[model samples]
Target chain A: MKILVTNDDGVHSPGLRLLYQFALSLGDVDVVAPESPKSATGLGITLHKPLRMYEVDLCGFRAIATSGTPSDTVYLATFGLGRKYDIVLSGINLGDNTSLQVILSSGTLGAAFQAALLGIPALAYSAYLENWNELLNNKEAVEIMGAVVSSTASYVLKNGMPQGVDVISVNFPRRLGRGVRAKLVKAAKLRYAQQVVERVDPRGVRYYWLYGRDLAPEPETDVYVVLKEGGIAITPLTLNLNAVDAHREVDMDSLNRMVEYINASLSKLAAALEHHHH
Target chain B: MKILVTNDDGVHSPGLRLLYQFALSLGDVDVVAPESPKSATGLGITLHKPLRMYEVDLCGFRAIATSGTPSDTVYLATFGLGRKYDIVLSGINLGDNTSLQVILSSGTLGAAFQAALLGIPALAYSAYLENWNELLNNKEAVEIMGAVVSSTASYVLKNGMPQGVDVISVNFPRRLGRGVRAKLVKAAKLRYAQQVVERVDPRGVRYYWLYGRDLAPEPETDVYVVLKEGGIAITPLTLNLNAVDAHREVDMDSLNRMVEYINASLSKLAAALEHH
Candidate 1:
């Protein structure tokens, strides 16, 4: 199998190197990633700017790096290469992309989503950030991470995802805590307390950074176990973002009220228009 | 109701003027938008760069313009603004955000999504790209477009979206088509044939631009009729991005195989580590 590997953590990221190593063992791997870290860039493609794709050698492999989002990298790679890639493996991202807000904003998953959109089977892998440097230093931790990557990649390669599933979102916690069994979970509601870190720069300019406090209610859900508590979360995602069953039925009484309100507003606009004409 | 107005077409967009005019007839309106056109950047925000918000006057409304994505404008507005806003009205954009691909790629929809995430009701309005320069020249087209803006804004304001809904995405055809009957429809699947235009710069560098031919098999779908065939499409979107129904069940035997492979791979890695 010919595998195309990518990440949101940029070209020089340690996580990208680790994942690239795993991809090499699986098949003929080609690396295409952003020249810079593109985290939190949700399924974004650079439309207004012209992209520049160039060759680079990183993590002991010749790779293609682009000046764009992870999604843009995948798009350019899929079409620009003029060859068919069997699968796409993205991330081993810096941190867990477990919650709705975070995952949708993830540049790692963005690559996988773009891959799926182009008719290629894709998977996104992420891990807990803490202890990463220390963990890679330890022999056993390296072994466990290697194991997780090998199994997950092979499984996906051997058997494609079930029908309607576009991409698989896999997350690894610091430790399975001795449990090797991976469970399938849904993208549960994440209760993240949004916090904006306000600070003043040396220039005395006030700037805000997007920071957060994740408050997932249950440990068994996607966000809590993998990110907050501890475990692996594997969720199947789709490219067709038609939220069918997500909304409750429209309230009829309120609906009628809305109709009346809209009619009144339209008439108000008409009156204003008439006055302007006069 | 304090309504914050914004768009993806930059603060200088003509659509910004149209929407700002509509926003004035509403309650309190404050404009915040990108300094330049930021199209096709989905729910992405600028993380690496420091955002700069400056004060400017456009279309008679004092606005805050930012050097960031549409999502960033809404983020700052939702947080940095002194007071709470009842709703957010984004766009009266240059074209239709109809298809699944196109709509999700929209910077306008991105702003609305960010607003919904911040616990505020948001709505995005869009229309086809036609005779916009000549639109104000005609009276009925102006009134019809005005009617759409007024109606959608008031409808969403009077009746909150159903539970689990985040934002309402609205689209108008070139012709208001002479009817005001609002239709409820699903966000349609779009079949876009991508075209990459290759060009050589002055320095002989090759650059590729992303172009597309939208080939929707079902012309009756939300994207096709509203955008291609001319009508209106108002789709309710969500911030949750659960997509639970989109996935089929896990393949059990394959999953077991994966576990075995992982176990074996770990052993291989351990042996390699032992040598190292």
Candidate 2:
């Protein structure tokens, strides 16, 4: 089976390369990614500009990079990749795509969402980084990521996905000593614990960098699973935003009355405007 | 009652001024609006940029302008206005905020959502403008919009909104001939009937303008009510985006197995990299 691999962390990112290698172990893997980093761009697509594509050789694997957002990469692969891919794998990202932060931003998840929108099954992978340099130095990080990908890929191949379900978001813990344990989890309800680090340039211009200071532990959530259990947490996500519970109790008569009042008011205003013009 | 009137169509927009005047007819009104137009900017706030405020005097109202999006106007009004407002009303906007379009790019609706988020009863208004110049010429359009503001405001005050309900999005038909009717309608499931107009600029740069064309009518939807019935269509909007229905059926066993495999794979990868 053909597998498509992509990421939001630019074409040259080590995380993307690791994901590519992992997908290769599963099946015929093709990589298409953003030419530059588009970290926090949420579901944004290139509408005005022409999307440019280029061929690249990354660590002995052939890949393509495009001048677009993470959503664009999936769009290109699904439509531009010639053959239909059984599954689309996104990320193995540097930071976790968790909580309400997923709603506002995270291009890594955006790629997965784009695939879902097109009725294609997809997954997003993220690893929590402890110390950027130290995490990079730890030789085991890439191997662990690849293993996660291969296993996840095999599972999907063996057990088919449900209809209408498009994307799954997977997050791995920082320390993986014991091995992999998967939990079907809900997104953590906790908000980001962030801080503003203030700095000044030589020219006396002040700037502030927004960064997360800590991740609050939610015992029953994906955050808890990854932080405490030191394994993988996969959460399924959908795009429908309607409030089904609220609709159940609404009184149509009261709702209709409210609508009538609004309509009359609009009519009176229009009449007044006509009177003023004459 | 003190009412805060604002819109996404900048401070200088006549639609905003008309709404302000209409609000004055009901109670004490204060206008807090964006300095420039922030049309279609969905639920976005100016976190990276410094927000600036200026007081402006219009013919019919006293207002404050913010160098931010419509959503920011509510934030400044709530905290910066120094007093709690009875109601927050946004728009009398130039266009409709319907369907999936309401998802993440509606400054008008975003303002209302922002107010709702603060536990304030909020309302958003929009007038369908097919021709910008024609809309300006129709003096009746402003009055119709003002009437909409007054009516919706009255309904909220008398009935008292349902608990936990955030905001109401009301769209006014552009042409008003028959009397108004309200529909407890479903959100119009409308896709972008998009048409790209490509052009070459003086610098030989090729660019395209995205425009919404031929609004397809859906039965019993908010769009249908405004287009066919010629009245106000109020869609109660909320901020929740979770997919609870699918959560129940996910296979936990498969998920656990996949997790175990990934952990083992990562361990081997880490060892390989160590040798390199």
Candidate 3:
């Protein structure tokens, strides 16, 4: 099966390499990713500028790096590559993409989502990191997680996805003290507890760095599930942004009155502007 | 009141000038907009690179031009300016910011929406100009529409707005052939009715350009409202992107089965090297 593998951590990211290794196990894998890191960019596409591409030999895979966002990588792969892939897999991201956080930002998940928009079934994978440097030390955790990712991806490939469902986000826990249990859990309600560290230059110009602190207390969230229970978190996401609840049936008369009030207010302002201009 | 004026059509746009002129009626206006056009850029923020700013004189107004998107313009206006503005206004955009089109991509409205997230009251304005250059030649239509815009904006400022609502998008008819009317219309149910034009250069390289063609037949959408009627269309927007309707509704037991089923399929391939 033809498979497209991509990530948000740029071309040389360790997490992406791990995911690529796992993906190569699945089938004919093609790697298309950002030339540089594009973290936290949500569902964005480049329209105005011409995207630049570079072919690089990485490990044993033929990887093409693009000077664009994660979403652009998928767009180029699907459209520019001129080939149809059975599936598009993004991430094995360095951080978790769960809950409202997914809504806020996530280039890894965003890439998968862009593919979904184009009628391609896509999956995004992420892993929790205790420390950036420590990920290299935990070979066992990486191996197990990679195995789980490859197995899950292959299953989805052989068994076709449901109709209308385009994308899914899967997040793996770090070295959970317990064991692995694949659970389809809801998104975590964890907010990024970020603190801005203020620093001063020699000239006394004050600048700040926004750093992520501990996850906020949302015990029922995906973060909570992974932290509490030793299992993988899967959250399904859709691209629709309409506020369906706010569109409930309301009195037309009230809406009409609001419109009339606005019109009258505009008339008054027109009179005032005429007087001022004259 | 210190008001910041911006638009998605680069700083050199006539629409930005029109918006600046309109904003002057409200209070002390400062213009901070993109150095280049950033049309259709959704709620995107630039945190990846250092932003560059240049000061320009535009018709007696002090404007700061930045190499960023509309959303980034507001970010710079807020944090870079180092002073809190009482209000932020984006657009007088060349096109309409209605319905799902507004939801999909719109740097014009996106600027206002981003500002709203920061607890600042923002307004986005669009003039439905299919061919603004052609319309500009028709002085009568321009004058009438300009009057309508000035009046509409002045009215919004004087009457104040609904409490807690951070941003509002206003779309004005391009011609206003006869006069003006106010409509609280629903956003148009429009889809991308056109495809990106693909072309090959002399050297055999392919390029694509996104351009909208015909409006959809759906009548209740924002595009229809402006095309069918000569008036101002106001759409209230919120920054919340949660698909609350689909929350926890899926059966977990079945979902797990699907997940496991999918996972089991990938166990057959040969594991490769873990290096990039």
Candidate 4:
């Protein structure tokens, strides 16, 4: 199988290197990622400008880096490469994307969503890292991470994604702790409370920096599984964004009435114009 | 009612002005939008730097313009303004946002989604204009456009959103045509074909530009209603991005089995560590 590996943390991130190692064991892997950190870029593409690409040696593997968002990277690899991939693996993102507020804006999930939009099965891996240097320095922790990545990816490759699920999001805790476990969960409604910092510059001009703090976790959610319980949180996601309860909740009779109102109003205006012309 | 009016086409856009006029007739209005055109920015926000806001005279009304994406503008307005808005009216966009691919990436719809996520009602207006200047130049066309905007906005304000619908997306055709109508429709799967343009600069460095052309319309979809039939297309959207069919289609048995497999493997590895 041909696999494409990418991350929002740029091509040189240690997390990307870790994912690349495990991905290599599975199949021929192609690496295309952002040249710089692209966290929170969402599913945005470069619509107004041209993109430039460069080749780099990433952990002895030749990889392509682009001056674009993670979503843009997927498009470049999928459409620009002139070849199809069996599956797309994104991240080992530096931070966990566990809530609707965070996941929809995550560059890692953005890449996965973009790939899934193109009918390619995709998976995104992320982690809550207390200390990046310390985690990589511990050989045992790295080994366990490798196993988690390999086993999950291998299973998906062998059996394919669960039906109705186009993308899978995996988030790892800061530490695997004793008797670590993995569970399926849905994204939380709000894991981060929104905050903003207002400050005046040295020049006496005021500006704002959007900031946030984490909220208490709720069970049966990705935030609770990964952040509170120190377990792996696997979230099944799909690109079909239609609200499931829309049909039941929406008043169709009222909707039809409004349509008729507009149509009748337009017809009367048309009639008025015709009479004036006569 | 307090209403926030914004658009992807900058604060000074004629489209924003149109939306602003209709919004004022509704209630007290707050104008906070991008300082410049931020088309296709999607739901992305600036996480790396501080945003700058400037107060400008938009159609004789004092409006705040920010150097941020449409999504960021909504955040700044929702959080930074220190006041609550009953609803958000985004756009009277210069181009149409039909189809899932286009709608999801539209900065206009992005602002609307951002508002809905904050528990505020939102409506996004767009049009497929053949000649923007000509459309606006005709007094009769402008009046009809105003009527459409006002009627829809008034109805939405009176009746909230259609139950579960969090945001409403309205797309207008180029002209009113001889017989115009409005219909509720779902976003089409695809409206534009994806294509790439590759070229070399004077220095011989290669680069690529992503581009696409419109595809034929599908019936009963937003694209067909607006682009093909010259009718208004109103699409109900929600911020709940979860896949509904997952419960039935996703094999819970296999998912649980994989979880058990991973846990067992971890337990074995932990045992090996204790032995060591």
Candidate 5:
């Protein structure tokens, strides 16, 4: 299988290097990623602006760098590469894309989601960002990344994903040397009780960084479950947000009743329109 | 009620004008949005990027423009406003935000989802743009906008959404003069069968636009149901993507069995690491 590799971090990111190396172990690999860090820049396309791509090497392998968002890079890669590939592997990201907050805001997952939109099965691998220099130099970290990706990729190749699941949202535990025990968990009921960091600039002007709090994850949720076991998480995600519980039987009935009010309002609106015309 | 108004369209979009007028009729309105167009920006935020907001008057009303995505603008608005808002309304977008294909890729709804994330209730209003000049010029279109937004916004402010409901996704018909008979519908299980349009430039460098095909929507879906009846669709959208069917019992059991296999694989990995 040919794997198209990309990430939220720039093409030059150390994590992308290891990820590229890991993909090389399993199959043919190609690198297409943003030229700069696109952290939390979810699926935002760069329209009305011409994208420039530079040809350079990533971790000794040649890569294409675009001055675009992660999503843009992945989408552009689909045509620029000019071949049908089996999988799109995005990220060995610097930070964990753990919660809904992270997942939705993630350029790592954004690339993966873009791949899925293009009908290419994808995996977004995230790791706890520690010391980059140390992590890159270590052999154990390298071996573990190889193992985790190979196993996950092989499993998808073999059994395929369950129905309704779109893409694999995976995160390696903090202790990368400890290796991975994988688990499939659900999306958490996550909400940040505290957000927004209010501060004044040097010139006394106000600025805000939409920051997250130390919110606890539910035990059964993807992040908590995987991190607790010193394992990697695999939350099956879909662009189709309706991949959960069903039949709001009562809710539907309530909505059905809304037809009455809606009709009355429409009548009132129609009357007003006639008055304007006459 | 102090309503925070924003959209994927920059502060100067024509749609924003009608939407601003709509909001003005309802209550106190403040506009904060991007300085340029940000279409298909799915809940993307600007972090690690310094943001700049310019205060300008939009259609005689003062508004703020940010060099950020819809998500960033709404987020910054939450703090820069220096207080809590009762509700946030995003868009009166130039195109319909329909189906998973559109919703998951919308900057209009992106701001709304961002508003919800800030613990403020929000609505994303979209319209089918058949003809920009004619559509915006028609008085019926304007009245329909007033009727649709006011009805939906007032309902939410009054009755409120139940648990599991997040943002409201409302779309007016292409024939805005036709008015609306609204309905609550669910997100469609829709995908474009073909998506890429490849072309070559003057120098023969291949370029591509990710375009969609004429795909059919399921009968019960929000877009299908609303458009079939020529009505506006109000899909209660959630940041939570888990508002559909499930196979948890079977899938979880399968996942549970994999634990033993994973542990064994990790052990093998440990062995390989030792050799390396």
Candidate 6:
């Protein structure tokens, strides 16, 4: 199995290094990631710019770093490198990507989305960490993370991806232990209460900084499982952004009802317009 | 009816100017948008940095332009401006934001998503334009576009968004005429065929450029309606990105079957790991 390892955190990130190590044990691993941190850059791609890549040595492993966003790395590795990877692994991200807002804005998940868009099975790993640098010194935590990754990767390699699942988002708790198990779950509907800090520069010009307060987690969500319950979260994500089914059931009955209402409404508006003109 | 007018195409955009004009006919309109083109920025919001806003004069109207992404403009206007808007009207964007791929990366739709996330009714407009500058010269086309915008805004302002729908994405054709009517439809499953161009720079380093070729439109899709059928396309968008219901039928039987397989698979894996 040929595995492609990447992350939103720069090429020097310990998360990417750890992911590369575990991947080497599983299959042929190729590491290509951003040269700098691109944290919240969702599914953004560089449109009219030329992307440059450099080969850098990370201790024993040689990695390719690019001057692009996380999504761009996936495209560069896939089409630029001209290699067909068996699976794509993104992150072990610096922060937990459990909520809808974070997940939507996460550069970690963005790489996975790009890979999934190109018909590749992908996994995005993130953790709740207040001190990301401390992860490097914690042996037991690293071992636990390694086990979870290896077990999940083994399951996928041995028996392909779960049917109908395009990408699986895995999020780890703040601290990993022996008892931490994975649970398949849904993402939280609301993650953060949006806020902006208004400030004035020394020159007397006003500016704003965006911030969010974490909301209370709902039951059975990724946030609830990983943050509240202290368990690993596995959320199956799809590329279909449609929400019609979410509000109303998509059945013949619902369609008929909607169509009937639409016709009557259109007629009513037409009559109103004609009356006004006359 | 308090309406917020914005776009990804900056404050001076003709698209935004047109939207602002139509919005004025509806209610009190506040125009706030990006300072420069932030096209295809998607749902990106600036973090760890301060965003600056400037009040600019766009002809007779005063608009606030911010140095931020399309998503940031929504936040700045909502939180900083501290105004509760009845609805958000984004774009009349220069290019069409059709297909799942385009929709996922479109800055025009990103503003609408942000608005809907905050429980505001939102509408995003785009068009298939070969010459966006020519839009100013074409009076009939502008009138038709205005009619569609006014009509849609009137419908929403009166009917209050279709039940449970969050955002409505409106796409106009290359040319607007008398018979160009709006059709409610689904976005095309696919739109662009992805490609990368490899080139050697002056320094002899290999660099790459990303590009895509427009795919053929499918029947009843937004792309087909606007580009192929020469009709306006109106697609209802929602914030729920979950796709479990997309593939499997959610039922008691299905759940039971999945559970049965899951238990067996877990046992098998656990046993195999112990053996190893």
Collision pairs in model 5:
A244-B244, A245-B244
User: What is the fnat of model 1 with respect to the true interface contacts?
Assistant: 0.30
Q: Positional deviation of B13 in candidate 2, in angstroms?
A: 4.9
- Every candidate's fraction of true contacts kept comes to 0.30, 0.08, 0.03, 0.44, 0.24, 0.49
Docking class of 4: incorrect
- Show model 6 residue runs off by greater than 4 Å: A39-43, A244-278, B39-43, B81-83, B244-276
Cα error of candidate 2 at position A82, Å: 6.9
> Candidate 5 lDDT, tens digit per residue, B1-276?
788888886788888877888888778888888888774333576656556777987657888988778877666776776787888888888877777656766789777876776667788998877446877678756766666677666556665543455676888776753324555566664434334566677996755555445466677676776566666666766565432224222122222222233334334444554564
The stretch of ten residues in a row with the least summed lDDT in candidate 6 chain B is B249-258
Query: Candidate 5 on A88-114: residue-level lDDT in tens?
Result: 888989877777756776789877776
For model 1, report the TM-score of its A chain.
0.78
- TM values, all candidates: 0.79, 0.66, 0.66, 0.83, 0.78, 0.84
Error of 2 at A21 (Å): 4.0
**Order of candidates by DockQ, top first?**
6, 4, 1, 5, 2, 3
DockQ of each: 0.14, 0.06, 0.06, 0.19, 0.13, 0.22
All candidates' lDDT scores? 0.67, 0.62, 0.61, 0.73, 0.66, 0.75
Chain B, candidate 2: TM-score: 0.78
Ten-residue region with minimum lDDT total, candidate 5 chain B: B247-256
Which should have the higher DockQ, number 2 or number 5? 5
Q: List model 1 lDDT by residue over B1-276, tens digit each.
A: 788999988888888888888777777788999888765333565655666777887746678888778877766776767656889999988877776656656789878877787778888988776636866675555655666666566655665544445777777777653443344455765435445556788999877675344565475567766756666665666555444543323233432332233334434444554455
Better of 1 and 3 by TM-score: 1
**Mind giving the per-residue lDDT tens digits that candidate 3 earns over A73-175?**
6657765557657889998787777665333456786677666655676888887774456766765456556656665576568754433234557777766
Q: How does residue A19 of candidate 5 score in lDDT?
A: 81
Docking class for model 3 is incorrect
Q: Provide the lowest-lDDT 10-residue window in model 2 chain B.
A: B247-256
Docking class of 1: incorrect
Reference-based lDDT, residue A218, model 2: 76
Regions more than 4 Å wrong, model 1:
A39-43, A130-132, A175-181, A188-192, A202-204, A212-218, A244-278, B39-52, B81-84, B130-132, B136-138, B175-183, B199-202, B243-276
